[PDB]
Coordinates of C-alpha atoms and ligand atoms in Angstrom, one line a residue:
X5 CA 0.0 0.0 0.0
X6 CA 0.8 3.5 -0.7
X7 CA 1.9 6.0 2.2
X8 CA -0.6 8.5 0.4
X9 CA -3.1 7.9 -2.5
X10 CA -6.2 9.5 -3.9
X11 CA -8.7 8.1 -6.5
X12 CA -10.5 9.3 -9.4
X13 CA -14.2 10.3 -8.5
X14 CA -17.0 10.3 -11.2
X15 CA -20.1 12.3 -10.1
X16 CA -23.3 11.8 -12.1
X17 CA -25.4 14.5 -11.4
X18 CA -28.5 16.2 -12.6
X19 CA -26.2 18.9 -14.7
X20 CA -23.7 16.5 -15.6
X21 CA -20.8 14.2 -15.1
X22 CA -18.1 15.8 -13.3
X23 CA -14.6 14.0 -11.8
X24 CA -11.9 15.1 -9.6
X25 CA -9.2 13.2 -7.7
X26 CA -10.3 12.6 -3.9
X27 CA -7.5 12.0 -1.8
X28 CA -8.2 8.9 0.1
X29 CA -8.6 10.2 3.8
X30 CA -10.8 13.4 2.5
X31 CA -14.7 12.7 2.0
X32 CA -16.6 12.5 -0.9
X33 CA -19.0 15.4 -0.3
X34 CA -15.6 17.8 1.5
X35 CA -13.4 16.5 -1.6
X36 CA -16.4 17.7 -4.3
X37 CA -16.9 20.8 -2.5
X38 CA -12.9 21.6 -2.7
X39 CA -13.9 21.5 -6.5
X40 CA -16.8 23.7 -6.7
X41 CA -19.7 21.5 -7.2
X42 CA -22.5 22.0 -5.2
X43 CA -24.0 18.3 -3.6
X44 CA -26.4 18.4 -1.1
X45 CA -26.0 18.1 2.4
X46 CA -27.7 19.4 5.8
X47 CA -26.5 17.3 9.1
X48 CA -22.7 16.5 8.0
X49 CA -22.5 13.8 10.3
X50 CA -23.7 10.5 8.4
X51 CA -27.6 11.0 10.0
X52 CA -29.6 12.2 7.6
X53 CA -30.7 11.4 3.9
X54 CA -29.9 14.7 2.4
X55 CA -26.4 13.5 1.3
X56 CA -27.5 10.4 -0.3
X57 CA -26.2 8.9 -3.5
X58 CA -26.2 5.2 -5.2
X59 CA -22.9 3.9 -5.9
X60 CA -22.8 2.7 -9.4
X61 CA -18.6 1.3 -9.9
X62 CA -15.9 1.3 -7.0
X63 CA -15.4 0.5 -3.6
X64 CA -16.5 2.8 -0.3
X65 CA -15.4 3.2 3.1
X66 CA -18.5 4.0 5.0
X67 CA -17.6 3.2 8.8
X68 CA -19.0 6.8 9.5
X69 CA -21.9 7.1 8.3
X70 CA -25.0 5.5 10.6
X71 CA -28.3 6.1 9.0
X72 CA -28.3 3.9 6.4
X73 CA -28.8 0.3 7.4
X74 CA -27.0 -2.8 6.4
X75 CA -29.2 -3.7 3.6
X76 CA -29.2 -0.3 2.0
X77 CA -25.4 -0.2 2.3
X78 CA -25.7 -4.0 0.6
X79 CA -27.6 -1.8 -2.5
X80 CA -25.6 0.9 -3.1
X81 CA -26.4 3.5 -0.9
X82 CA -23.8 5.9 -0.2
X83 CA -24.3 9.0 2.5
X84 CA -21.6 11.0 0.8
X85 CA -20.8 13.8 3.8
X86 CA -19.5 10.1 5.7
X87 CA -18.0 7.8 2.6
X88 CA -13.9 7.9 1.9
X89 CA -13.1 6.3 -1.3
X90 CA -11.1 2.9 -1.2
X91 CA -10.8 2.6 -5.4
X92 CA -11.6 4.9 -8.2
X93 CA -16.0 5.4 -7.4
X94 CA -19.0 6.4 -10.2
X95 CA -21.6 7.8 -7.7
X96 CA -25.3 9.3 -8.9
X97 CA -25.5 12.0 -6.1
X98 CA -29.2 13.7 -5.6
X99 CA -30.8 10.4 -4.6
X100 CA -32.6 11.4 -1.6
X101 CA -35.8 11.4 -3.2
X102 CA -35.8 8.2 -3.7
X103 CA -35.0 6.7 0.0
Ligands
FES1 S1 -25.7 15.4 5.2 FE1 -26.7 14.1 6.7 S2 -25.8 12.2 6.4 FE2 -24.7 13.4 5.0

């Protein structure tokens, strides 16, 4: 393993796809933000829906988030204020609707 590494991020949102590298210790949303797109988000803290997102390619770390349950996590769910990439990721972010 790598002392430090970061991994491509693909973002499908409603304007558009948009990537950026996300270092691997930095959050999805905090990493996004650094780049100027705007992703919803209210609580920060991996309790809420607001952040939500459906992994579609990758691999997650999502030990901080709690309010998704196990089979949601099982389906792709992603809270995105509370997720740290472990490989390069393709999330669809503005999911909340659908929860
Ligand atoms: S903004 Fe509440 S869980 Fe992410």
């Amino acid at each position: 393993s790598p002392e430090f590494a970061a991994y491509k991020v693909t973002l499908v949102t409603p304007t558009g796809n948009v990537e950026f590298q996300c270092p691997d210790d930095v959050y999805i949303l905090d990493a996004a933000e650094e780049e100027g797109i705007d992703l919803p988000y209210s609580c920060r803290a991996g309790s809420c829906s607001s952040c939500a997102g459906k992994l579609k390619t990758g691999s997650l770390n999502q030990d901080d988030q709690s309010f998704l349950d196990d089979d949601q996590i099982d389906e792709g769910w992603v809270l995105t204020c509370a997720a740290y990439p472990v490989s390069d990721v393709t999330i669809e972010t503005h999911k909340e609707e659908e929860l």
